[PDB]
Design a protein around this ligand. Structure first.
Ligand SMILES: OC[C@H]1O[C@@](CO)(OC[C@H]2O[C@@](CO)(OC[C@H]3O[C@@](CO)(OC[C@H]4O[C@@](CO)(OC[C@H]5O[C@@](CO[C@]6(CO)O[C@H](CO)[C@@H](O)[C@@H]6O)(OC[C@H]6O[C@](O)(CO)[C@@H](O)[C@@H]6O)[C@@H](O)[C@@H]5O)[C@@H](O)[C@@H]4O)[C@@H](O)[C@@H]3O)[C@@H](O)[C@@H]2O)[C@@H](O)[C@@H]1O
Ligand SMILES: OC[C@H]1O[C@@](CO)(OC[C@H]2O[C@@](CO)(OC[C@H]3O[C@@](CO)(OC[C@H]4O[C@](O)(CO)[C@@H](O)[C@@H]4O)[C@@H](O)[C@@H]3O)[C@@H](O)[C@@H]2O)[C@@H](O)[C@@H]1O
Ligand code: MG
Ligand code: MG
Lengths: 924, 551, 99, 50
C-alpha cells in the first residue's frame, strides 16, 4: 500500500532488509531501490552517503529522512533499524513536497513497529559474525623492494650501490647488454646505532585483524481496542578489521498510542534513546601503511616502536599510530521523541497536533601522546582535547484534514502549518604538558602547559504552510494538487518566503470497461506528475558579511592559520598580543530559494493474478537559482566567497523494477526481484569563478558547464615508448624517453603542452542493477542478492603508487607488487612504464592511465536458513524458532581493465570486509 | 512573526559594524598579522620557494618529485600556467592587499581631531599595500593595481592588469611609498610599525626597479631612466637614514640571531613571536621546510656550490671575477670571505655556531642522499638550543625576517650612482668598501676557525681610484651576490639587470657536471624570467587578464 | 574592564543491575517468603570547562570561546565508584499473628 | 504516558526555573502470565538562572 498512489514511490521489503544483518537499515538497501545510490566505505559504523535521482544540486545532497512523521537529516547508523515495519522512498518532488520543505534531494519514510490490535508478541534476535579482510593490497617485501630499486637505478643509469639504504647488489650484464640482477644483501641494522634491525614486515597484516560483530535485539508488542504499545531493546557491537577501531550502540525504543472518548480522541508517542561509543581509524591509515616500506620493523631493539632511520622515507608507524589512537573514543547520545494528539469532531474531520524533538549530545576526549619513531617525532608533545557538542531540533505540526465520499467522487482536503527550529553548539578545551601520559591522568586540570578554549554556536528556523487536495473519480481518475509556502531564517525579509506548486494525474487503464476480456492483465496504471520544490541547505550565516576575531588559537597545517595576532611591539611574545578581525565572507541580501522542477512519468503493471508486477519510470529534474558559494575572483582576497543563485542542474533518468513470485508443483516458492536504473547529469549554468577554479569538475582547465558533474579533464596516454624510434616519431614533449608514457597530441601542434587535454573522467555509470532471489522449500529459506554497476569510470589513486616508482610526494616509498611487471628490454610484453627515480616525463599529471573501468557485480548478501517445524515449536511452546547462516560481500566479479581490487572502494579509504554471520530468531 | 528573526549570528561581527571607530585599530593589527600568519610552507612572503630559479641554491627535499612544480621552476622546463603554487602565492598576496584596503577604508571614515594618528595609520596601511604590490610586480610583470579601498566587491570583476603600463604600474606602486614617507613619523616606538626611513628606502628600491625599463611586448631592457636614478639618490640620502637611527651592525651574524632582533640594520622586519598565546606562536612557518635533516625532516633551500665558490677570494682579498667557479673552494688552500660561514653551513663545521652539532656528509644532514649536496643555509635557521625553536608539525622559530637592510640601502645607492655615470663613482666605491669592511670585522663567532679548521680569512676594501662603469657594475654585482646569499634576491636582481638568461644558462652548464637535475634544464630568452599569470585567474576574468610574453 | 566566558559541561552516569530470586510458601497456617538478591551499581562522573577573555561586543551572542582574544584556560576532572551487594530476606508468618 | 511543563519566576529579579518532563511506563504479560517485561522511563529538561 503506497501512501501517495500517484507518484514515484518505492516500497522496501523490510524482511529482506533485516536478513543482511546490517546496523544501518539504509546501508542494507544499497541497491534495492531504483534511482538510489548508497556508498559505504566499510567502517564499523553504518555511515553511508545517499544520492537520490543523481546529483540535483550543488549544495548538500543528503536526503530528508522521516521517522514517525518527524523529519531529520542525521545518519541512521546511530538509530536502531531492526524495529522498522515499513520503508517508503519518495523520489518525486510532487509526492515528497507535502512531507516537508527539505524534499529537494528526496524523502525517505521510515515507520517504526507498533503493537498490532488483538495480539501480543515478542521477538528475540541474536547474531554473531566474523569479519575478515579481503582487499589486502599487495605490496613489495624486502627482496621485492630491493629488486625494484635496483631496476629503477639501472634504468636511470645510476649506480644501484649508491642507494645508501643498506642494499648491496651483485649484478652484471647479459649478452644483449641489458642489466641483470644476480643477488642482493642487506645490513643487519638500518642505522649506525644498531637499534633498528632489518626485517620483513607485512604492514597490512600487522594493522588488520579479524573483527567480531555481535547483535542482540528483544522487542515486545501488545495491541488492544483501547490502545497499543511496543518496547524494544537493542545492542550492537562491531570491531573493525583495522586494529583499535570499534563501534557499539545501545538502543531503547518505546512506542504507544491510546484511544479515548469513543475513538474521538487519540494520543500517541514514539520515543527512542541511543548511546553509541566509537573509536575511529585515523585519517589516511591505509595510505600510511602502504607508504611505509616493509624493511622497517614493528618494534626496535629496545622494545620501542619502530621507525625509519637514516635515508628511509619519513613515514610514521601505522601500528604505533593505531595504538596511540585507541584512546580517542567518542560517545554520542541520540534522543528522538515525538508526541501527537488527534481529534475527530465528526466522521470526516481530523485535527492533529504533533511535537517532535531530536537532541544529540557528543562527548570526545582526544589524546596526543609523545612519540619517537626513529627520525619521526613530535618533540615530546603530549596534549588533551575535551570536546562537547550539542544539537537540538524541535518541530511543531498542526494538520487539518477533511474527507468526503459523495457519490462516486472521493475528496480529501488537508491543510498544515509546520514550524522547525534547530540550534547547534560546541565547545572544547585544550591542555598540554602531561607527565604520566595515560588516559586516567590526562585531564585538563592535571595539565601544566598552555590551555586553549574553542566555542561556537549557530542555528536556523523554518516555517511552512502547505495544502493538499486529492480527487478520485470512479476509483479510476486520480488528481492531486499541492501548494507550499516556505520561509527560512537564512534569507532576508524580502526573499524570506517562496511558493511551490505540484500537480499529479493518474489513470487506471485496467478499470476501463473496454478491456474486460484482458483477464491476464490484472492491473495497469499510467501516472504523471509535475512539481516544484525549494532548496535552502546552505550556511546559516550566508547573507551576512562575516568578520571574525581569529586570534590564531586553532591548529593549522603548514602555518596558514590566517590568524589575527601580531607582535607590534617586537618583544618576541611573552603576553597577549594585540588582535583584530578578518573577513570570512561577503554577505548577499538577494539570495532566495533554489527551485527544483521535477517531471515524472510512471507505468505500473501487474499480470497473472498479481504474480508478475513491475513499474517503469522516467524522470526529468531541472534545478535553477541554485545557491552556490562562489569563490573570490582572485584580487578580492579573503572573504571573497559569497552565496549566489547562479546554478543550473539537469538530470534525465530511467528506472525499471520487476517482480515475479510463484510456487512449484513439488513445493518450492521462488520470488525474483529485478531492478535497473540509469541517469544522465548535466551542468547548464555556473558562476565564472566556480568554473575557473573547477571545484565541480574540469580540474581548473576547462569549464564544467555543458558536461556531467564531477567530470575530469586530463591527458590521453597512447601507450608507452618501446624504442628510441618511437620517441623520435612522436611529437616532442618534456621528459620523453624509452619506457615513458606517450601523450596524444589532440590539437596536432607538434608539441605536448597544457592545451593537450580533454574530458577523460565521467563519474556516471551506464546502469546500476540488482537482483534478489528468495527460495522456500521444506522449511529452508535461501536469500541471494546481487548488485552490479556497469559503465562507470573510476580514478585510481592506488595506481599512482603501484604502476610507478617515486611518483609520490617523497621517494623510496613502498609500492605495489605489480610494479615488478614493468616494461624493460628483458620483458617487452608489458604496459606498465619502466621504473625511474626522476619524474622527468611528469607522469603524476591527470591522464587516461589512472582512469579504469569501475564495472562490477558482487553478491551483497547470501543467507541460508532453517525454520523449526510448527509442531516442534508448539511442543516447546515457541511460536517461531529459526536459525540462519549468511555471507556478506563474499564474492565479486570485476572487469579485466581494473588492475586494482574492490571496485566499489578503489581508494585508500576504509576497506570492505567479508562477513560470515550465524543468527537465531525466537518468537516466545 | 518573530519566529524567523529570533536567532542571530553568534561570535561574529557583521559587515555594517566593522566600520565603527572602536574596531579600526584592531583592523590595523589585522593588516600586520597577515604578514606573519598568512604564509604557507610552499608559499612564503620571503619568496625563497621561487628563488630556486637563480644560481644561489637548489631545491631541497627527498628528491625532484618533492615539490615537482618547484623543481620545474628551478629547471625552467615543463612549467604550466595551471600551477597550484603560482595561484596560491597570487591569492595570498591579494589577500594581504585586501586586508590593507579594508584597513584603509575603515581609517578613511574618521575625523582628524578624534583620531590624531589617522595619518600615521593610513601611511602604514599604504606602505603594507605597496609592499604587497611590489612583491607581486617582482613575481609577475602584469599585476592588478588594487589601490581603491572605497571600491565595491562587484567592481573587482572589472579590474584588469593592462589598465596601466609597466611605467604607470611602477608609478602607482611608488605613490603609496611616497605618501608613507611624507606621513610616517621619523622614529617609531613600536618596531613592528615601519618608520619614515624604511618607507624612503623601499621607495628608493621601487624607483631603482623602475629605472630598468622593460618597455615593449617582450621582456628585454630598453634603456635606463636618469630621473628614476635621481629619485633613488634623493631618497637614499644618509641624512634620512641617520634621522631614524639606522646603520650597519658591528657584526654580520647579528642580523640573523634572535639575541639581536630589531637591530640598527633591521630597518623593517616581520615580528615573529613565541609564547604569545596562540596555538604554537607566530613563528616563521615559511622557513619550516628549510630546517636541516638533523631536526628530523624538511631540509629545503640548500645553497649551491656556485655561491660557495663565489664567496672564495684571492690573495688580495678581492673576489675571483673569472676563476672562482673553475675549481671547488678549498678550506686549507683558498682564501674565503668571512660572510660564507654566516650564510652557508659547510660540512665539517659547527651548525649555527654550535660545537655540539657538526655537519657531516651523511644521511643525517641531507635528505636527498647527496643529490642536492650537503650545504645548509644558516641565515634563516636558529640554534637547536636557542629555546626559540618550536615543533608545530614543522620546525619553525621566532627569528624576525628583515625585509629591508641598511646594506641593501647602501648597495642601492651605489647602483644608482654607478648607473648615473655623472660622477660620484668614488662614493659608490666608498659604500662598497664600507660593506667589505663590515664583512671583514664579522668574526666574533668564527675567530677560532683559524686555529680549529685552518680557515684563512682575507677580504680587503677596494682601492679608491677611478673606475670604469662596467668594472664598477661588476664589483657591485659581486658585492650583492656575496652579501645577500640565501636572502631571496638574486633572481630578481638578475631579471632587473637584464642578464638573467646568460647567467642562468652558464650556471646550468657549469652545474650539470656535478648535478644531474640540470641535465635537461633550459632557460628561455623571454619566457622564464617572469612567472606566468595563473590560468584560473584568466579564466575567471574573461577578456581582462593578458598572459605574459612567451607563454 | 574584565570580560570573560566560561563554558562548562558535566556528565553523570549511573547504571544498576539487580537479580532477585523469591520463593513463597503457604503451608498450613505458616507463610514463608525467602528472597535472595545480587546488586551491582556503577557511577561515573566527569566535567570539563573552557575559559576565555578579552571580548569586545559584550553580548551573549558574541561571547564565545572562539570569539575571544585573551588568555584561555581548560579545566577537567573525572571520578567514579562501584558497589556490590548480596542480600537475603526471610519472612515467616504464623496464624497471621506472629511475624 | 505523561507530559508535564513547569515554570517558576522567582521573587528575586532575573532568576527563574522551568522544566519539561516526559514519562513513559509500560508492562506486558506473555506466556500465560509466566513471563513479564516492564519498563519505566522519564526524560527531564530543566533550564534555570539562579
Ligand atoms: O597534491 C595533493 C593536493 O595538494 C594541493 C591542494 O590544492 O596543493 C598542495 C597543497 O598541499 C600543501 C600542504 O600544506 O603542501 C604539500 C606539498 O608540500 C611538499 C613540498 O612542496 O612537501 C612538503 C613536506 O611535507 C611532508 C612533511 O614533511 O609531507 C607532506 C605530505 O604529507 C601530507 C599527507 O600525505 C598523506 C595523505 O594521507 O599522509 C601520509 C603522510 O604524509 C602520506 O602517506 C600521504 O601522502 O600531510 C602530512 C601528514 O602528516 C601527518 O602528521 C599525519 O597525520 C599529518 O599532519 C598530515 O596529514 C600532505 O600534507 C602531503 O602530501 C613531506 O613529505 C614534504 O617534504 C610537497 O611534497 C607537497 O606536495 C600545501 O602547501 C599545498 O597547498 C594540490 O596540488 C593537490 O590537489
Ligand atoms: O573533518 C572531516 C572528517 O572528520 C569527520 C569526523 O571523523 O568530521 C569531523 C566533524 O564532523 C562532526 C560534525 O557533525 O560529526 C561527524 C562525526 O561525528 C558522527 C557521530 O555520530 O556524526 C555526527 C552527526 O553529524 C553527521 O556526521 C553529519 O550530519 C551525521 O552523519 C551524524 O549524525 C559521526 O557519524 C561522524 O564521524 C563532528 O562530530 C566532527 O567534529 C568526518 O565526518 C570526516 O570524515
Ligand atoms: Mg598539442
Ligand atoms: Mg621575533
Amino acid at each position: 500500500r503506497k501512501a501517495d498512489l500517484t507518484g514515484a514511490v518505492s516500497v522496501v521489503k523490510v524482511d529482506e532488509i533485516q536478513k543482511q544483518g546490517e546496523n544501518n537499515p539504509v546501508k542494507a538497501l544499497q541497491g534495492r531501490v531504483p534511482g538510489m545510490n548508497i556508498t559505504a566505505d566499510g567502517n564499523p559504523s553504518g555511515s553511508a552517503t545517499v544520492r537520490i535521482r543523481g546529483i540535483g544540486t550543488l549544495n548538500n545532497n543528503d536526503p530528508l529522512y522521516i521517522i514517525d512523521g518527524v523529519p531529520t537529516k542525521a545518519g541512521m547508523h546511530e538509530l536502531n533499524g531492526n524495529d522498522i515495519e515499513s520503508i517508503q522512498v519518495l523520489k518525486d518532488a510532487a509526492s515528497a513536497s507535502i512531507y516537508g520543505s527539505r524534499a529537494a534531494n528526496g524523502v525517505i519514510i521510515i515507520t517504526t513497529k507498533q503493537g498490532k490490535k488483538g495480539q501480543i508478541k515478542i521477538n528475540f534476535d541474536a547474531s554473531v559474525s566474523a569479519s575478515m579482510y579481503q582487499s589486502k593490497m599487495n605490496v613489495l617485501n624486502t627482496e621485492q623492494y630491493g629488486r625494484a630499486m635496483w631496476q629503477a637505478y639501472v634504468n636511470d643509469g645510476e649506480n644501484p650501490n649508491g642507494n645508501a639504504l643498506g642494499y648491496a647488489y651483485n649484478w652484471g650484464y647479459n649478452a644483449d647488454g641489458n642489466p641483470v640482477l644476480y643477488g642482493m644483501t642487506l645490513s643487519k641494522y638500518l642505522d649506525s646505532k644498531n637499534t633498528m634491525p632489518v626485517a620483513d614486515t607485512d604492514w597490512f597484516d600487522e594493522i588488520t585483524r579479524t573483527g567480531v560483530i555481535q547483535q542482540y535485539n528483544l522487542s515486545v508488542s501488545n495491541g488492544s481496542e483501547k490502545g497499543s504499545s511496543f518496547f524494544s531493546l537493542g545492542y550492537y557491537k562491531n570491531l573493525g578489521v583495522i586494529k583499535d577501531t570499534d563501534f557499539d550502540r545501545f538502543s531503547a525504543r518505546m512506542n504507544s498510542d491510546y484511544k479515548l472518548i469513543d475513538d474521538i480522541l487519540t494520543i500517541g508517542q514514539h520515543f527512542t534513546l541511543n548511546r553509541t561509543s566509537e573509536v575511529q581509524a585515523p585519517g589516511g591509515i591505509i595510505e600510511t601503511a602502504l607508504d611505509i616500506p616493509s624493511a622497517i620493523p614493528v618494534y626496535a631493539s629496545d622494545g620501542s616502536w619502530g621507525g625509519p632511520v637514516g635515508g628511509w622515507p619519513d613515514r610514521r608507524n601505522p601500528r604505533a599510530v593505531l595504538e596511540y589512537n585507541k584512546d580517542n573514543r567518542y560517545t554520542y547520545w541520540r534522543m528522538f521523541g515525538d508526541a501527537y494528539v488527534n481529534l475527530t469532531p465528526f466522521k470526516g474531520f481530523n485535527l492533529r497536533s504533533t511535537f517532535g524533538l531530536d537532541y544529540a549530545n557528543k562527548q570526545a576526549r582526544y589524546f596526543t601522546y609523545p612519540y619517537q619513531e626513529g627520525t619521526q617525532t613530535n618533540n615530546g608533545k603530549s596534549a588533551v582535547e575535551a570536546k562537547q557538542e550539542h544539537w537540538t531540533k524541535w518541530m511543531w505540526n498542526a494538520i487539518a484534514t477533511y474527507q468526503l465520499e459523495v457519490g462516486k467522487h472521493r475528496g480529501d482536503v488537508m491543510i498544515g502549518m509546520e514550524l522547525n527550529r534547530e540550534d547547534d553548539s560546541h565547545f572544547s578545551g585544550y591542555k598540554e604538558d602531561f607527565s604520566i601520559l595515560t588516559p586516567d591522568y590526562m585531564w585538563p586540570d592535571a595539565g601544566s602547559g598552555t590551555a586553549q578554549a574553542y566555542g561556537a554556536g549557530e542555528g536556523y528556523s523554518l516555517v511552512s504552510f502547505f495544502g493538499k487536495m486529492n480527487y478520485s473519480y470512479a476509483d479510476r481518475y486520480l488528481l492531486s494538487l499541492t501548494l507550499r509556502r516556505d520561509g527560512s531564517s537564512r534569507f532576508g525579509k524580502n526573499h524570506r518566503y517562496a511558493t511551490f506548486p505540484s500537480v499529479s494525474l493518474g489513470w487506471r487503464i485496467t478499470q476501463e470497461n473496454f478491456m474486460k476480456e484482458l483477464t491476464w492483465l490484472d492491473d495497469l496504471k499510467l501516472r504523471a506528475s509535475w512539481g516544484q520544490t525549494g532548496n535552502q541547505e546552505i550556511s546559516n550565516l550566508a547573507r551576512y558579511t562575516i568578520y571574525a576575531p581569529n586570534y590564531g588559537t586553532t591548529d593549522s597545517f603548514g602555518g596558514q592559520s590566517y590568524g589575527t595576532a601580531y607582535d607590534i611591539t617586537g618583544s618576541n611574545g611573552g603576553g597577549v598580543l594585540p588582535s583584530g578581525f578578518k573577513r570570512n565572507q561577503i554577505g548577499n541580501d538577494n539570495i532566495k530559494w533554489e527551485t527544483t522542477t521535477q517531471t515524472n512519468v510512471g507505468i505500473d503493471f501487474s499480470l497473472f493474478k498479481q504474480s508478475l508486477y513491475g513499474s517503469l519510470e522516467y524522470y526529468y529534474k531541472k534545478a535553477t537559482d541554485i545557491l552556490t558559494e562562489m569563490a573570490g575572483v582572485g584580487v578580492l582576497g579573503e572573504g571573497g566567497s559569497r552565496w549566489i543563485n547562479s546554478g543550473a542542474m539537469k538530470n534525465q533518468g530511467f528506472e525499471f523494477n520487476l517482480g515475479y513470485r510463484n510456487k512449484t508443483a513439488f513445493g518450492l516458492t521462488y520470488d525474483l526481484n529485478g531492478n535497473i536504473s540509469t541517469y544522465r547529469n548535466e551542468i547548464l549554468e555556473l558562476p565564472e569563478t566556480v568554473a575557473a577554479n573547477g571545484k565541480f569538475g574540469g580540474n581548473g582547465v576547462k569549464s564544467v558547464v555543458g558536461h556531467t558533474y564531477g567530470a575530469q579533464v586530463g591527458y590521453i596516454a597512447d601507450g608507452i615508448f618501446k624504442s628510441q624510434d618511437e620517441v623520435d616519431n612522436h611529437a616532442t614533449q618534456e621528459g620523453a624517453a624509452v619506457g615513458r608514457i606517450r601523450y596524444r597530441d589532440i590539437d596536432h601542434n607538434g608539441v605536448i603542452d597544457e592545451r593537450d587535454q580533454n574530458w577523460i573522467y565521467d563519474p556516471t555509470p551506464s546502469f546500476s542493477y540488482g537482483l534478489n532471489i528468495y527460495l522456500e522449500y521444506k522449511n529452508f529459506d535461501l536469500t541471494m542478492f546481487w548488485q552490479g554497476v556497469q559503465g562507470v569510470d573510476i580514478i585510481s589513486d592506488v595506481k599512482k603508487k603501484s604502476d610507478f616508482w617515486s611518483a609520490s610526494n617523497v621517494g623510496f616509498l613502498n609500492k605495489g607488487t605489480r610494479l615488478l611487471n614493468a616494461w624493460s628490454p628483458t620483458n617487452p610484453n608489458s604496459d606498465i612504464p619502466a621504473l625511474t627515480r626522476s619524474d622527468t616525463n611528469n607522469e603524476q599529471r591527470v591522464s587516461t592511465y589512472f582512469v579504469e573501468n569501475g564495472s562490477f557485480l558482487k553478491l551483497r548478501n547470501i543467507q541460508l536458513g532453517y525454520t523449526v517445524p510448527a509442531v516442534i515449536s508448539k511442543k516447546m511452546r515457541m511460536d517461531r524458532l529459526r536459525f540462519y547462516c549468511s555471507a556478506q560481500n563474499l564474492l565479486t566479479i570485476k572487469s579485466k581493465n581494473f588492475t586494482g581490487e574492490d571496485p566499489e572502494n578503489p581508494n585508500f579509504s576504509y576497506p570492505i570486509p567479508v562477513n560470515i554471520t550465524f543468527g537465531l530468531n525466537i518468537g516466545f | 512573526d518573530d519566529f524567523l528573526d529570533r536567532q542571530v549570528p553568534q561570535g561574529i561581527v557583521t559587515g555594517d559594524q566593522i566600520a565603527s571607530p572602536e574596531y579600526v585599530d584592531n583592523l590595523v593589527i589585522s593588516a600586520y598579522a597577515i604578514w606573519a600568519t598568512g604564509d604557507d610552507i610552499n608559499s612564503s612572503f620571503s619568496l625563497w620557494n621561487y628563488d630556486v630559479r637563480s644560481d644561489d641554491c637548489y631545491k631541497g627535499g627527498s628528491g625532484t618529485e618533492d615539490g615537482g612544480v618547484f623543481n620545474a621552476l628551478e629547471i625552467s622546463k615543463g612549467i604550466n600556467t595551471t600551477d597550484w603554487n603560482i595561484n596560491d602565492i597570487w591569492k595570498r598576496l591579494y589577500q594581504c592587499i585586501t586586508r590593507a584596503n579594508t584597513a584603509l577604508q575603515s581609517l578613511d571614515q574618521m575625523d582628524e581631531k578624534t583620531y590624531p594618528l589617522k595619518n600615521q595609520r593610513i601611511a602604514e596601511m599604504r606602505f603594507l599595500r605597496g609592499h604587497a604590490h611590489f612583491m607581486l610586480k617582482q613575481l609577475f610583470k602584469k599585476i592588478v593595481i588594487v589601490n581603491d579601498e572605497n571600491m565595491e566587491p562587484d567592481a573587482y570583476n572589472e579590474l584588469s592588469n593592462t589598465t596601466y603600463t609597466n611605467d604607470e604600474q611602477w608609478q602607482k606602486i611608488a605613490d603609496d611609498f611616497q605618501f608613507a614617507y611624507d606621513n610616517l613619523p621619523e622614529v617609531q616606538i613600536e618596531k613592528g610599525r615601519p618608520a619614515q626611513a624604511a618607507a624612503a628606502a623601499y621607495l628608493a628600491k621601487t624607483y631603482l626597479y623602475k629605472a630598468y625599463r622593460q618597455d615593449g611586448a617582450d621582456n628585454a631592457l630598453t634603456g635606463i631612466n636618469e630621473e628614476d636614478l635621481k629619485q633613488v639618490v634623493k631618497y637614499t640620502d644618509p641624512l634620512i637614514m641617520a634621522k631614524g637611527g639606522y646603520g650597519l651592525e658591528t657584526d654580520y651574524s647579528m642580523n640573523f640571531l634572535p639575541q639581536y632582533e630589531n637591530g640598527a640594520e633591521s630597518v623593517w622586519a616581520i615580528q615573529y613571536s613565541i609564547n604569545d598565546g596562540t596555538y604554537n606562536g607566530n613563528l616563521n612557518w615559511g622557513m619550516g621546510l628549510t630546517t636541516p635533516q638533523i631536526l628530523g625532516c624538511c631540509d629545503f633551500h640548500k645553497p649551491s656550490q656556485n655561491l660557495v665558490n663565489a664567496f672564495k677570494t684571492d690573495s688580495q682579498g678581492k673576489p675571483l671575477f673569472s676563476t672562482y667557479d673553475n675549481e671547488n673552494y678549498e678550506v686549507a688552500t683558498d682564501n674565503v670571505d668571512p660572510r660564507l660561514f654566516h650564510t652557508v653551513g659547510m660540512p665539517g663545521f659547527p651548525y649555527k655556531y654550535n660545537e655540539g652539532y657538526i655537519i657531516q656528509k651523511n644521511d643525517d644532514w641531507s635528505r636527498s642522499k647527496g643529490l642536492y649536496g650537503y650545504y645548509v643555509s644558516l641565515k634563516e635557521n636558529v640554534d637547536p638550543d636557542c629555546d626559540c625553536l618550536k615543533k608545530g608539525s614543522y620546525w619553525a622559530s621566532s627569528l624576525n625576517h628583515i625585509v629591508i637592510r641598511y646594506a641593501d640601502v647602501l648597495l642601492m645607492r651605489a647602483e644608482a650612482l654607478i648607473q648615473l655615470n655623472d660622477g660620484r663613482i668614488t662614493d659608490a666605491i666608498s659604500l662598497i668598501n664600507e660593506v667589505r669592511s663590515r664583512a671583514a670585522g664579522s668574526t666574533m663567532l668564527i675567530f677560532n676557525y683559524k686555529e680549529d679548521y685552518g680557515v684563512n680569512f682575507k677580504v680587503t676594501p677596494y682601492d679608491l681610484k677611478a673606475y670604469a662603469q662596467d668594472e664598477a657594475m661588476k664589483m657591485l654585482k659581486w658585492e650583492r651576490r656575496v652579501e645577500f646569499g640565501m636572502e631571496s634576491s638574486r633572481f630578481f636582481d638578475l631579471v632587473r639587470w637584464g642578464e638573467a638568461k646568460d647567467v642562468i644558462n652558464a650556471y646550468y652548464v657549469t652545474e650539470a657536471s656535478r648535478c644531474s637535475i640540470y641535465k635537461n634544464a633550459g632557460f628561455t630568452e623571454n619566457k622564464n624570467e617572469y612567472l606566468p599569470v595563473p590560468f584560473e585567474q584568466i579564466s575567471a576574468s574573461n577578456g581582462n587578464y593578458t598572459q605574459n610574453f612567451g607563454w
